[PDB]
Amino acid sequence: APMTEVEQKAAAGVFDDANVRDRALTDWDGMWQSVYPYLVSGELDPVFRQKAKKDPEKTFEDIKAYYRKGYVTNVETIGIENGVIEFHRDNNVASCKYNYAGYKILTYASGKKGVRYLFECKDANSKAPKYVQFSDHIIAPRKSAHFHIFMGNTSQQALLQEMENWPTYYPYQLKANEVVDEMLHH
Ligand SMILES: [Zn+2]
C-alpha cells in the first residue's frame, strides 16, 4: 500500500516518537544500486535544478555539491536477503550476517527528525562493516523504496554522529530516468 498521512509526514521529518517502531532487516531485502554514478554522469541534474528553482536562496551547484559529499562511495551495489548483507566495492566483495541492535531517533539542526535502524555484523574478522545503520524516512515496519546506509567499523555511537556522508541505494533494476522520477515526485 501507498503511504498514510502519518507516513508522509514522517517522511518529511515530522512525527511523534510514540509512533516509532522496531523494524527487521527484511524491510531492506533486495538488490540495490548506489545512485552516486548517476550524480557523476550528470543524470541527477534535473533533481537539483528543480530544488534550486523552488528556493531562491539555494544554487544548483551548491545543492549538487551537498549531494556529492552525501552520495560518494565505492560500494556500487548492495544485496540483502536472509539476515545477510553483501557489499560490492569495486572488485571487492564482503558479506556478513547482521544482528538487529535497535533504533535511534534523531533531531537535526533543521529541527526535522529521522530514525536510524542499527545493525551489527556477527564476525570480528569480516571485510564487511561491523556497524551499519539504515535511514529511509520510515519510522515503522514498511518495505523500503530506497535507503541511506551508514557503514563503519568503530562504534555505533560514532556512526550516529556522521551527517555529511550517507551512500544512497535505489532498487537495482531501476533506470536513471526512473530514479530521477522518484526523487522529483516524493
Ligand atoms: Zn532518501
Tab-separated table of C-alpha atoms and ligand atoms in Angstrom:
chain	number	residue	atom	x	y	z
A	1	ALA	CA	0.000	0.000	0.000
A	2	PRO	CA	0.811	3.730	-0.555
A	3	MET	CA	1.577	5.967	2.411
A	4	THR	CA	-0.836	7.063	5.134
A	5	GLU	CA	-0.747	10.682	6.093
A	6	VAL	CA	1.239	9.754	9.211
A	7	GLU	CA	3.784	8.003	6.960
A	8	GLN	CA	4.010	11.104	4.614
A	9	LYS	CA	4.672	13.490	7.497
A	10	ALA	CA	7.187	11.092	8.954
A	11	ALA	CA	8.895	11.007	5.572
A	12	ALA	CA	9.114	14.794	5.740
A	13	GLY	CA	10.705	14.561	9.204
A	14	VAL	CA	7.590	15.354	11.269
A	15	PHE	CA	6.499	12.535	13.607
A	16	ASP	CA	5.629	11.617	17.205
A	17	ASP	CA	8.317	9.445	18.948
A	18	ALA	CA	5.490	7.354	20.434
A	19	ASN	CA	4.850	6.064	16.883
A	20	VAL	CA	8.386	4.850	16.142
A	21	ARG	CA	8.649	1.050	15.997
A	22	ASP	CA	11.423	-1.523	15.543
A	23	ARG	CA	11.987	-2.903	12.065
A	24	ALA	CA	13.545	-6.059	10.656
A	25	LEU	CA	16.287	-6.417	8.105
A	26	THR	CA	13.614	-7.802	5.720
A	27	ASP	CA	12.370	-4.280	5.151
A	28	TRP	CA	15.562	-3.883	3.060
A	29	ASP	CA	15.701	-7.229	1.227
A	30	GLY	CA	16.576	-6.982	-2.428
A	31	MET	CA	19.358	-5.886	-4.769
A	32	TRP	CA	20.350	-2.228	-4.604
A	33	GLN	CA	22.361	0.270	-6.693
A	34	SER	CA	24.271	3.310	-5.454
A	35	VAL	CA	22.909	6.447	-7.041
A	36	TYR	CA	26.372	8.019	-6.873
A	37	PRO	CA	27.254	7.078	-10.505
A	38	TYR	CA	24.149	8.986	-11.634
A	39	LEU	CA	25.205	12.130	-9.787
A	40	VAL	CA	28.585	11.757	-11.552
A	41	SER	CA	27.250	11.133	-15.061
A	42	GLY	CA	25.136	14.271	-14.522
A	43	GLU	CA	21.838	12.404	-14.835
A	44	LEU	CA	20.633	13.700	-11.460
A	45	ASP	CA	20.961	17.326	-12.555
A	46	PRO	CA	17.147	17.775	-13.149
A	47	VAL	CA	16.634	16.977	-9.460
A	48	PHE	CA	18.978	19.631	-8.213
A	49	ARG	CA	17.630	22.079	-10.807
A	50	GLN	CA	14.080	21.613	-9.529
A	51	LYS	CA	15.272	22.135	-5.909
A	52	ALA	CA	17.170	25.327	-6.802
A	53	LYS	CA	14.152	26.633	-8.766
A	54	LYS	CA	11.908	26.206	-5.723
A	55	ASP	CA	14.295	28.128	-3.418
A	56	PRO	CA	15.871	31.470	-4.432
A	57	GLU	CA	18.390	31.214	-1.529
A	58	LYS	CA	19.872	27.956	-2.962
A	59	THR	CA	22.063	27.414	-6.014
A	60	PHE	CA	22.326	24.476	-8.382
A	61	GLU	CA	25.981	23.905	-7.882
A	62	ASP	CA	25.670	24.098	-4.099
A	63	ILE	CA	22.819	21.590	-3.923
A	64	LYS	CA	24.752	19.232	-6.150
A	65	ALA	CA	27.869	19.542	-4.024
A	66	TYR	CA	25.809	18.691	-0.929
A	67	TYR	CA	24.541	15.528	-2.669
A	68	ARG	CA	28.096	14.831	-3.933
A	69	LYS	CA	29.508	14.751	-0.440
A	70	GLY	CA	26.477	12.717	0.657
A	71	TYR	CA	26.274	10.091	-2.049
A	72	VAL	CA	30.039	9.446	-2.626
A	73	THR	CA	31.061	5.855	-2.105
A	74	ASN	CA	32.638	2.980	-3.913
A	75	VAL	CA	30.065	0.426	-2.715
A	76	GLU	CA	28.247	0.380	-6.059
A	77	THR	CA	25.729	-2.360	-5.180
A	78	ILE	CA	24.352	-3.988	-2.025
A	79	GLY	CA	22.364	-7.265	-1.752
A	80	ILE	CA	20.252	-8.140	1.295
A	81	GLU	CA	18.428	-11.438	1.949
A	82	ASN	CA	18.213	-13.973	4.835
A	83	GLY	CA	19.749	-11.744	7.554
A	84	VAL	CA	22.832	-11.266	5.341
A	85	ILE	CA	24.148	-8.096	3.758
A	86	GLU	CA	26.538	-8.230	0.918
A	87	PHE	CA	28.682	-5.263	-0.296
A	88	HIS	CA	30.360	-4.879	-3.642
A	89	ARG	CA	33.042	-2.239	-3.575
A	90	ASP	CA	34.710	-2.051	-6.859
A	91	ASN	CA	36.127	-5.594	-7.270
A	92	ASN	CA	35.907	-6.380	-3.609
A	93	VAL	CA	33.068	-8.182	-2.068
A	94	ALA	CA	32.260	-8.935	1.514
A	95	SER	CA	29.224	-10.153	3.419
A	96	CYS	CA	28.128	-10.740	6.944
A	97	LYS	CA	25.097	-11.996	8.864
A	98	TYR	CA	23.781	-8.953	10.734
A	99	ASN	CA	22.016	-8.775	14.123
A	100	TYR	CA	19.457	-6.093	14.904
A	101	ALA	CA	20.546	-3.610	17.557
A	102	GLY	CA	17.652	-1.225	17.925
A	103	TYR	CA	16.741	2.080	16.582
A	104	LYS	CA	17.682	5.629	17.354
A	105	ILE	CA	15.685	8.793	16.911
A	106	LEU	CA	17.488	11.928	15.733
A	107	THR	CA	16.640	15.608	15.695
A	108	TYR	CA	18.590	17.562	13.068
A	109	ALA	CA	19.873	21.153	13.119
A	110	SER	CA	16.874	21.949	10.953
A	111	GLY	CA	14.544	20.702	13.723
A	112	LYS	CA	13.361	17.863	11.454
A	113	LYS	CA	13.580	14.357	12.827
A	114	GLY	CA	14.677	10.963	11.463
A	115	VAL	CA	15.110	7.370	12.648
A	116	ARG	CA	18.088	5.057	12.168
A	117	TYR	CA	17.906	1.280	12.414
A	118	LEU	CA	21.107	-0.211	13.781
A	119	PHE	CA	22.788	-3.449	12.806
A	120	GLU	CA	25.998	-5.182	13.856
A	121	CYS	CA	27.967	-7.823	11.996
A	122	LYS	CA	28.496	-11.258	13.604
A	123	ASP	CA	32.260	-11.726	12.665
A	124	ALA	CA	35.113	-9.587	14.061
A	125	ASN	CA	37.249	-10.739	11.085
A	126	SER	CA	34.829	-9.978	8.188
A	127	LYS	CA	35.619	-7.459	5.487
A	128	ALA	CA	32.010	-6.195	5.860
A	129	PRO	CA	31.395	-3.156	8.093
A	130	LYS	CA	30.808	-4.066	11.744
A	131	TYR	CA	28.132	-1.421	12.106
A	132	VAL	CA	25.524	-0.434	9.606
A	133	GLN	CA	22.650	1.926	10.203
A	134	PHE	CA	19.683	2.292	7.910
A	135	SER	CA	17.862	5.546	7.326
A	136	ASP	CA	14.930	5.728	4.911
A	137	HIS	CA	12.321	8.180	6.123
A	138	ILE	CA	10.233	5.399	7.534
A	139	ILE	CA	9.586	5.017	11.200
A	140	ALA	CA	7.717	1.672	11.431
A	141	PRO	CA	7.553	-1.656	9.596
A	142	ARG	CA	7.322	-0.977	5.836
A	143	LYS	CA	9.283	-2.248	2.852
A	144	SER	CA	11.873	0.301	1.687
A	145	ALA	CA	11.814	2.182	-1.573
A	146	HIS	CA	15.331	3.433	-1.271
A	147	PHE	CA	17.689	3.892	1.679
A	148	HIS	CA	20.733	5.638	3.124
A	149	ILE	CA	23.121	3.373	4.840
A	150	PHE	CA	25.826	4.442	7.315
A	151	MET	CA	28.727	1.933	7.317
A	152	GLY	CA	31.555	1.892	9.837
A	153	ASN	CA	33.938	-0.187	11.916
A	154	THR	CA	34.489	1.831	15.073
A	155	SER	CA	31.314	2.049	17.147
A	156	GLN	CA	27.542	2.603	16.671
A	157	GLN	CA	27.886	5.918	18.562
A	158	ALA	CA	30.491	7.193	16.130
A	159	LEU	CA	28.280	6.479	13.077
A	160	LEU	CA	25.357	8.233	14.722
A	161	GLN	CA	27.413	11.394	14.521
A	162	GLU	CA	28.016	11.052	10.738
A	163	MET	CA	25.806	13.710	8.965
A	164	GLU	CA	27.712	14.558	5.832
A	165	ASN	CA	28.163	11.218	4.040
A	166	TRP	CA	25.246	8.748	3.550
A	167	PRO	CA	25.639	6.423	0.497
A	168	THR	CA	22.244	6.041	-1.086
A	169	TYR	CA	20.619	2.986	-2.719
A	170	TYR	CA	17.667	2.517	-5.112
A	171	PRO	CA	16.370	-0.908	-6.401
A	172	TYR	CA	18.980	-2.382	-8.816
A	173	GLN	CA	16.532	-2.767	-11.746
A	174	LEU	CA	15.752	0.965	-11.955
A	175	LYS	CA	16.980	3.165	-14.868
A	176	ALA	CA	18.320	6.713	-14.355
A	177	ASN	CA	15.102	8.274	-15.703
A	178	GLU	CA	13.167	6.347	-13.094
A	179	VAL	CA	15.498	7.240	-10.182
A	180	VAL	CA	15.034	10.961	-11.056
A	181	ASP	CA	11.260	10.474	-11.297
A	182	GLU	CA	11.077	9.021	-7.784
A	183	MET	CA	13.278	11.878	-6.475
A	184	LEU	CA	11.068	14.574	-8.114
A	185	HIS	CA	7.752	13.042	-7.071
A	186	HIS	CA	8.100	12.010	-3.358
B	1	ZN	ZN	16.156	9.353	0.836
